[PDB]
Amino acid sequence: PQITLWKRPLVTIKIGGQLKEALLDTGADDTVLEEMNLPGRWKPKMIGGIGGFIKVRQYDQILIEICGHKAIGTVLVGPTPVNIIGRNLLTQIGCTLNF
Amino acid sequence: PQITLWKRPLVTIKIGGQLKEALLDTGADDTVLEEMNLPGRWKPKMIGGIGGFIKVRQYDQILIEICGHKAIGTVLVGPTPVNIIGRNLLTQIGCTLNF
Numbered sequence: 001p002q003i004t005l006w007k008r009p010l011v012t013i014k015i016g017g018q019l020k021e022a023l024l025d026t027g028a029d030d031t032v033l034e035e036m037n038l039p040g041r042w043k044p045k046m047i048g049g050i051g052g053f054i055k056v057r058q059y060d061q062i063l064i065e066i067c068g069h070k071a072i073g074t075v076l077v078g079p080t081p082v083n084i085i086g087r088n089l090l091t092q093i094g095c096t097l098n099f
Numbered sequence: 100p101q102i103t104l105w106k107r108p109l110v111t112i113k114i115g116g117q118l119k120e121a122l123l124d125t126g127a128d129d130t131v132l133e134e135m136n137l138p139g140r141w142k143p144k145m146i147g148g149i150g151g152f153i154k155v156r157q158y159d160q161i162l163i164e165i166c167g168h169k170a171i172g173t174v175l176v177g178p179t180p181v182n183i184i185g186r187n188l189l190t191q192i193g194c195t196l197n198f
C-alpha cells in the first residue's frame with residue numbers, strides 16, 4: 001500500500017506467532033522490538049539513537065510478516081519505547097520513499 | 100524521486116544558506132539538526148529518542164530546502180548524532196512510504 005506521514009506510520013506485524021504494532025522507520029538501520037521472550041540463541045548488542053544507547057538481545061533469521069509481506073532477518077529485542085521496523089527488513093518488502 | 104533503502108536515505112539540504120547532509124526519517128516526529136548557527140529567535144526544548152532525552156533549541160518557521168523541495172517549519176538544533184528530517188517537514192515535500 002501507500003502510507004502517508006501525517007501520523008506515525010504504524011502497521012500490524014506478525015512475529016513469533018504474535019501480532020504487534022510497529023513503526024516503519026527509514027531512519028533505523030536495524031529492527032528493534034519491545035521486550036518479548038523469543039526462543040533460541042541470541043547475542044548481546046548495543047544500539048544507539050538520540051539520547052544514547054540501550055542494551056538489546058540480537059536474534060538472527062527471525063521471520064516477520066509486515067502487512068502480509070514476509071521478511072526474514074535480524075531482530076533486536078530490548079527496552080525500546082516503540083517497536084521499530086528498520087531498513088534491514090524494509091528492503092525485503094520492497095519499501096521505498098517517494099516524493 | 101523514488102528512494103530505496105539498501106543504503107541510508109541521505110540527502111543534501113540547504114538551511115540558513117548552508118548545505119548539509121541529512122537523513123530522511125519516517126520514524127521521527129520532528130526534524131533535528133546538529134549544533135549550528137541559525138538566524139532568528141529560539142526557545143529551549145527537550146526531545147526524546149531511543150536512548151533518552153536531549154536539550155535542543157527550537158526554531159520556528161525556518162526555511163529549509165530538501166533536494167530542491169522547499170519546506171518552512173520547525174527545526175530543532177542540538178547534540179543529535181545525525182541530521183534527521185522528520186515527518187513535520189517530510190509531509191510538506193509530499194513524501195510517502197510505498198510497498
Ligand SMILES: COC(=O)N[C@H](C(=O)N[C@@H](Cc1ccccc1)[C@@H](O)C[C@H](Cc1ccccc1)NC(=O)O[C@H]1CO[C@H]2OCC[C@H]21)C(C)C
Pocket residue numbers: 025026027028029030031032047048049050081082084124125126127128129130131146147148149180181183185
Ligand atoms: C544506526 O543508528 C540507528 O539506526 N538508530 C535507530 C534510531 O534511533 N533512529 C532514529 C533516527 C536516528 C537517531 C540517531 C542516530 C541514527 C538514526 C529514528 O529513526 C527512530 C526513533 C524511534 C523512536 C520514536 C519515539 C521515541 C523513541 C525512539 N525516532 C526518533 O528518535 O525521533 C526523535 C526525533 O523526533 C522525535 O519523534 C520520535 C521520537 C523523537 C535505532 C531505532 C536503531
